[PDB]
Design an enzyme around this catalytic site. Structure first.
Site, PDB file in Angstrom:
ATOM      1  N   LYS A   1     -15.398   2.241   3.366  1.00 57.00           N
ATOM      2  CA  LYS A   1     -14.273   3.114   3.613  1.00 57.00           C
ATOM      3  C   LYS A   1     -14.251   4.360   2.734  1.00 57.00           C
ATOM      4  O   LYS A   1     -13.809   5.409   3.173  1.00 57.00           O
ATOM      5  CB  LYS A   1     -12.974   2.323   3.465  1.00 57.00           C
ATOM      6  CG  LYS A   1     -11.695   3.133   3.491  1.00 57.00           C
ATOM      7  CD  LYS A   1     -10.489   2.227   3.591  1.00 57.00           C
ATOM      8  CE  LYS A   1      -9.184   2.955   3.408  1.00 57.00           C
ATOM      9  NZ  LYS A   1      -9.119   3.604   2.070  1.00 57.00           N
TER      10      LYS A   1
ATOM     11  N   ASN B   1       0.830  -1.192   0.000  1.00 59.81           N
ATOM     12  CA  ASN B   1       0.000   0.000   0.000  1.00 59.81           C
ATOM     13  C   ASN B   1       0.867   1.246   0.000  1.00 59.81           C
ATOM     14  O   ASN B   1       1.883   1.335   0.715  1.00 59.81           O
ATOM     15  CB  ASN B   1      -0.911  -0.003   1.239  1.00 59.81           C
ATOM     16  CG  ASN B   1      -2.065   0.959   1.087  1.00 59.81           C
ATOM     17  OD1 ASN B   1      -3.060   0.585   0.426  1.00 59.81           O
ATOM     18  ND2 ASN B   1      -1.925   2.174   1.634  1.00 59.81           N
TER      19      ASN B   1
ATOM     20  N   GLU C   1      -5.438  21.198  10.797  1.00 60.42           N
ATOM     21  CA  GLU C   1      -5.923  20.124   9.950  1.00 60.42           C
ATOM     22  C   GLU C   1      -6.881  20.595   8.877  1.00 60.42           C
ATOM     23  O   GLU C   1      -7.255  21.764   8.770  1.00 60.42           O
ATOM     24  CB  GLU C   1      -6.518  18.995  10.816  1.00 60.42           C
ATOM     25  CG  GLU C   1      -5.522  17.868  11.025  1.00 60.42           C
ATOM     26  CD  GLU C   1      -5.153  17.051   9.769  1.00 60.42           C
ATOM     27  OE1 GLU C   1      -5.792  17.284   8.704  1.00 60.42           O
ATOM     28  OE2 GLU C   1      -4.303  16.152   9.877  1.00 60.42           O
TER      29      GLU C   1
ATOM     30  N   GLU D   1      -1.235   0.084  -4.945  1.00 65.34           N
ATOM     31  CA  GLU D   1      -1.320   1.351  -5.688  1.00 65.34           C
ATOM     32  C   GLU D   1      -0.342   1.369  -6.848  1.00 65.34           C
ATOM     33  O   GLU D   1      -0.660   1.948  -7.881  1.00 65.34           O
ATOM     34  CB  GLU D   1      -1.065   2.572  -4.787  1.00 65.34           C
ATOM     35  CG  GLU D   1      -2.229   3.025  -3.918  1.00 65.34           C
ATOM     36  CD  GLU D   1      -2.552   2.191  -2.708  1.00 65.34           C
ATOM     37  OE1 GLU D   1      -1.795   1.224  -2.398  1.00 65.34           O
ATOM     38  OE2 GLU D   1      -3.593   2.534  -2.057  1.00 65.34           O
TER      39      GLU D   1
ATOM     40  N   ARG E   1      -0.144  11.899   7.978  1.00 67.46           N
ATOM     41  CA  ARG E   1       0.789  12.849   8.548  1.00 67.46           C
ATOM     42  C   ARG E   1       1.754  12.173   9.509  1.00 67.46           C
ATOM     43  O   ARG E   1       1.438  11.176  10.177  1.00 67.46           O
ATOM     44  CB  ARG E   1       0.012  13.922   9.299  1.00 67.46           C
ATOM     45  CG  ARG E   1      -0.634  13.516  10.617  1.00 67.46           C
ATOM     46  CD  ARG E   1      -1.511  14.621  11.157  1.00 67.46           C
ATOM     47  NE  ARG E   1      -1.895  14.294  12.537  1.00 67.46           N
ATOM     48  CZ  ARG E   1      -2.991  14.681  13.155  1.00 67.46           C
ATOM     49  NH1 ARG E   1      -3.962  15.327  12.508  1.00 67.46           N
ATOM     50  NH2 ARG E   1      -3.109  14.421  14.448  1.00 67.46           N
TER      51      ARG E   1
ATOM     52  N   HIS F   1      -5.720   2.121   5.093  1.00 68.74           N
ATOM     53  CA  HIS F   1      -4.943   0.941   4.755  1.00 68.74           C
ATOM     54  C   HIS F   1      -3.647   0.805   5.533  1.00 68.74           C
ATOM     55  O   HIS F   1      -3.224  -0.314   5.848  1.00 68.74           O
ATOM     56  CB  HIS F   1      -4.706   0.856   3.261  1.00 68.74           C
ATOM     57  CG  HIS F   1      -5.977   0.593   2.522  1.00 68.74           C
ATOM     58  ND1 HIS F   1      -6.103   0.847   1.160  1.00 68.74           N
ATOM     59  CD2 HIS F   1      -7.126   0.039   2.969  1.00 68.74           C
ATOM     60  CE1 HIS F   1      -7.325   0.434   0.834  1.00 68.74           C
ATOM     61  NE2 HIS F   1      -7.987  -0.056   1.888  1.00 68.74           N
TER      62      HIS F   1
ATOM     63  N   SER G   1       0.220   5.404   0.676  1.00 70.59           N
ATOM     64  CA  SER G   1      -0.790   6.340   1.176  1.00 70.59           C
ATOM     65  C   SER G   1      -0.110   7.532   1.843  1.00 70.59           C
ATOM     66  O   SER G   1       0.983   7.450   2.351  1.00 70.59           O
ATOM     67  CB  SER G   1      -1.752   5.695   2.140  1.00 70.59           C
ATOM     68  OG  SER G   1      -1.079   5.175   3.270  1.00 70.59           O
ATOM     69  N   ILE G   2      -0.847   8.637   1.882  1.00 72.84           N
ATOM     70  CA  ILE G   2      -0.463   9.798   2.673  1.00 72.84           C
ATOM     71  C   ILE G   2      -1.117   9.686   4.044  1.00 72.84           C
ATOM     72  O   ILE G   2      -2.325   9.509   4.169  1.00 72.84           O
ATOM     73  CB  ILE G   2      -0.870  11.133   2.030  1.00 72.84           C
ATOM     74  CG1 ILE G   2      -0.254  11.286   0.654  1.00 72.84           C
ATOM     75  CG2 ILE G   2      -0.483  12.303   2.944  1.00 72.84           C
ATOM     76  CD1 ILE G   2      -0.669  12.516  -0.080  1.00 72.84           C
TER      77      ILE G   2
END
Ligand SMILES: Cc1cc2c3c(c1C)C(C)(C)C[C@H]1C=C(c4ccccc4)[C@]4(C(=O)NC(=O)N=C4N2C[C@H](O)[C@H](O)[C@H](O)COP(=O)(O)O)N31
Ligand SMILES: Cc1cc2c3c(c1C)C(C)(C)C[C@H]1C=C(c4ccccc4)[C@]4(C(=O)NC(=O)N=C4N2C[C@H](O)[C@H](O)[C@H](O)COP(=O)(O)O)N31
Ligand SMILES: [K+]
Ligand SMILES: [K+]
Ligand SMILES: [K+]
Ligand SMILES: [K+]
Ligand SMILES: [Mn+2]
Ligand SMILES: [Mn+2]
Lengths: 500, 500
Positions: free
Chosen positions: B388, B165, B279, B230, B170, B188, B167-168
């Site tokens: 999700k 996986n 945020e 991805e 923080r 994920h 992903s972004i």
């Protein structure tokens, strides 16, 4: 005469402001005038003055569109409204609404009767006019009639003489000497009509004055209290007694400088087809004719070179947003304060199609109340939704002191981030609803009841100890010196005027 | 290398587009870089490239702010996103989201392993770096740490090797060789972490790559399905196999042209202080430190003259709106269609702080379903809010085919005029909620459950016989010939360019 006291002078003021386009070639009142005006309203352009209207005869009539709509620049956005009130053209919304509320704790200044005025320059008796022969506009292609009345003032008086009401309500031509129009509860024209119907003796003496003093048309659009004669409220607001002349065929009094005056009666027994009409929420339902109240016209008087104001209403932004929403919000602000609620400001966001009002809360005062969201929402909604000033408004959004309710982006931010759907809301089903909203009159439930909500966008600590966040924005998330350095170096670095 | 396949080339593309400001004088990573970036995001200015960052040593690092934020003109509003994807800079939102969805019914194109790449130009072992000594930004004045990770890609793989996986999420510096970050359900990175924790044998092999191929960071921000690697999705989307190199200290693979790579482990047992952070919804709650997941860094590799991308997130408009909201909406559109719901388009309005998604309905298909608002709202909300892809979204607004969901003014108009509060809505309290929204995690109810709603802005006849209104706008309330005449004569009369 001053622009706020004389419609003809108001037109000159718009010219002087470079806020008028005079159109001197022929324009058709069948859709073309209103299409131009619609385009103006959707783009915040200059107001159009149609000086050569196809069908104008014997001085009836020119049209001014978009009299209370927005200007393009931010700095004088509300300048047309300011010109209704003798305010500087850069006046803020707060300043306009405060001016409109100012007469609420002043003695009325009753009007002054004068023997004549410009509205008497010309007349047509019952053998000389035919309303179907005047250049009355078709404003939207599916309208059920030609809506002569979108920005004039109906004048009716209680049977006992003690209350004379001035208000805007639409009306269209029925035949050569009748109009039909909306006359619906809880509006004051309806309340007075009901008084006459219960007396049962006669039709209601009536006048409809077009091109009245701008300060008067503003009050005509505002839900000032039951029983309060708008003329005296406008007198107090402006500091001047308004000059009125008597009608010729009844004992009502009209502004001396009215452009056009219809004199006659509002029936206590007859109705006729009315609507549909492209309306303030942005819709028309073609074919949805309803019965409306029926007006008989006995006489017309008018100024030389009379000008009829017209609202080409619908989608944003026109008089139905700038005036109906904002003036209701003003009255709601006062109502809340008079009910001991800690409201500092109110505005109907344009983005809501003026169906919401955002209420700015003094949260220091809120904290002292030692209350909760459920309790406070219920209190606020009971006050507002049980009152005529709340009639048009279906959602109240409570926000704390950081939010400028006059800025719809900020209201939307607060609503979307601080009000939990369901839990932070109270629904009101047993209050009067506003049928003109599509989801009411053309919706799934009762057209006239319910569908209202108070949405609490106050955060929990705003009720207790105080705001417990900082915004993640340039303003709040960087110290003052750094912000100033950034701004000072902005163009130097390579990045990109108030009036624009 | 193409701009969508190589971050260094993407930076050149922004320069070539006249969409970059290079700042070559010293800039402080303590707030100043992020303040400039914040100002850019709030005004849709050019992206800033900080080439002289106070504290940069041995090539670590420059910063690019606002990599996925908006341009000022309407014509290339989304041009930075288009530059992530090889699309023309004038691409519409629909076109961007279709590109992002295109790989969903294509065979994956797995990545290609190459022996080296620019990300190997420099290295620092565990005795040579100290994360507290790098010019990591303080992004907001009340942040609980210096957030090194706002626009890099975490890489973790399932224990069995079958799913890798990207992903972004923080992360901030904890100490010389650790980060803390958000790792929360149902994301994920969290799902894979849980697999490792249940196996119980080791910490999770991990890499964090900054300045990855732009097409890859877009997929990293999108909720593509569980179990889908991805890299292969991006390969299919771009039509090219992505070139990856092996990490030095583990067997994960990173993009060959990554600007900066951290290699290490995500602990299955340790936590540390994480947050608060300014945020995506526009807030920080100072002092609200929570525990977060803990990452150990064993090695850094990086390009000569490495560039760190940074999101200075908060109030509108930045990557957290343009990418999180839009890419979730795209996935929701597909999810709805795969569940046989007649949805043509979806978008998360910026005005909602990307907490709403508007769903455009094919009302011809809806009519054939012979259903009702209650039933349809429930079906839609069950599909979306139980998945999700719906995690971040708290209000769905159903609109008919006249509404362009990519235009927030029109969504707001429809919502405000066609959805009766309460009656035309279904609340969902027994679904996963998004705690980051202030009214959730800092609100009156459970932080992790409920607070969701489906708001039906379909009108009654849209379910039965068809739309029964016309808008009261210039477009719909005047015939074609008249509209054209008005437009043709607009400047002639006196009234007031696409690119701008
Ligand atoms: C500025 C303006 C106001 C109104 C209207 C219009 C404009 C331009 C048009 C374009 C003609 C559209 C329709 C649409 C209208 C509409 C109908 C119901 C509620 C709101 C609007 C209506 C209307 O037909 N009927 C109505 O009962 N009130 C109207 N008002 C509001 C009304 O002037 C205020 O409510 C005011 O407070 C009345 O005075 P009072 O009774 O308090 O003394 N009308
Ligand atoms: C574009 C972008 C995406 C995210 C973030 C940011 C940016 C710039 C920052 C600025 C760092 C702000 C925070 C705020 C974040 C946040 C937290 C929860 C939900 C949404 C956002 C978060 C984060 O910390 N945690 C998180 O779990 N997801 C994040 N996402 C969304 C995430 O990339 C997508 O959801 C994507 O689908 C994940 O992939 P997968 O799991 O489907 O493979 N993060
Ligand atoms: K009134
Ligand atoms: K709340
Ligand atoms: K992803
Ligand atoms: K509805
Ligand atoms: Mn009144
Ligand atoms: Mn994934």
């Amino acid at each position: 005469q001053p622009a706020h006291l004389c419609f003809r002078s108001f037109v000159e003021a718009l010219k002087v402001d470079n806020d008028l386009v005079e159109i001197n070639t022929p324009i058709d009142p069948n859709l073309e005038a209103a299409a131009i005006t619609r385009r103006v309203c959707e783009t915040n352009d200059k107001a159009p003055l149609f000086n050569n209207l196809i069908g104008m005869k014997n001085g009836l009539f020119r049209i001014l569109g978009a009299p209370g709509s927005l200007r393009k620049s931010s700095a004088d956005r509300y300048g047309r409204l300011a010109r209704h009130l003798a305010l500087p053209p850069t006046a803020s919304m707060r300043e306009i609404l405060d001016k409109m509320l100012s007469a609420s704790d002043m003695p009325p200044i009753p009007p002054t009767i004068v023997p004549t005025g410009p509205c008497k320059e010309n007349s047509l008796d019952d053998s000389e006019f035919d309303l179907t022969e005047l250049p009355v506009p078709l404003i939207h292609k599916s309208d059920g009639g030609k809506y002569i009345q979108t920005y004039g003032m109906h004048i009716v008086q209680s049977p006992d003489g003690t209350w004379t009401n001035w208000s805007i309500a639409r009306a269209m031509v029925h035949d050569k000497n009748h109009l039909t129009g909306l006359v619906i509860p809880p509006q004051h024209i309806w309340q007075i009509h009901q008084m006459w119907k219960k007396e049962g003796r006669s039709d209601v003496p009536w006048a409809l004055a077009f091109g009245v003093p701008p300060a008067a048309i503003m009050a005509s659009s505002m839900p000032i209290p039951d029983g309060v004669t708008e003329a005296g409220y406008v007198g107090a607001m402006t500091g001047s007694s308004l000059e009125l002349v008597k009608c010729d065929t009844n004992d009502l009094y009209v502004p001396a400088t009215s452009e056009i005056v219809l004199e006659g009666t509002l029936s206590i027994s007859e109705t006729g087809p009315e609507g549909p009409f492209g309306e303030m929420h942005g819709y028309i339902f073609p074919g949805d004719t309803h019965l409306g109240a029926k007006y008989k016209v006995n006489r017309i008087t008018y100024r030389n070179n009379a000008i009829m104001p017209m609202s080409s209403c619908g989608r944003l932004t026109d008089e139905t947003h700038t005036m109906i929403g904002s003036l209701a919000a003003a009255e709601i602000r006062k109502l809340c304060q008079q009910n001991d609620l800690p409201i500092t400001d109110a505005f109907a966001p344009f983005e809501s199609q003026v169906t919401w009002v955002a209420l700015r809360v003094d949260t220091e005062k809120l904290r002292a109340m030692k209350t909760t969201s459920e309790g406070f929402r219920k209190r606020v909604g009971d006050v507002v939704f049980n009152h005529k000033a709340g009639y048009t408004i279906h959602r109240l959004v409570l926000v704390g002191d950081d939010i400028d309710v006059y800025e719809g982006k900020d209201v939307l931010w607060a609503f979307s981030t601080r009000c939990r759907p369901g839990m932070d809301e109270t629904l009101f089903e047993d209050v009067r609803g506003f049928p003109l909203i599509p989801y009411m009159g053309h919706g799934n439930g009762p057209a006239h009841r319910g569908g209202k909500v108070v949405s609490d966008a106050l955060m929990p600590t705003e009720y207790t100890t105080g705001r417990n966040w900082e915004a993640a924005d340039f303003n709040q998330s960087y110290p003052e010196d750094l912000k100033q350095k950034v701004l000072d170096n902005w163009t130097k670095m390579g990045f990109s005027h108030h009036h624009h």
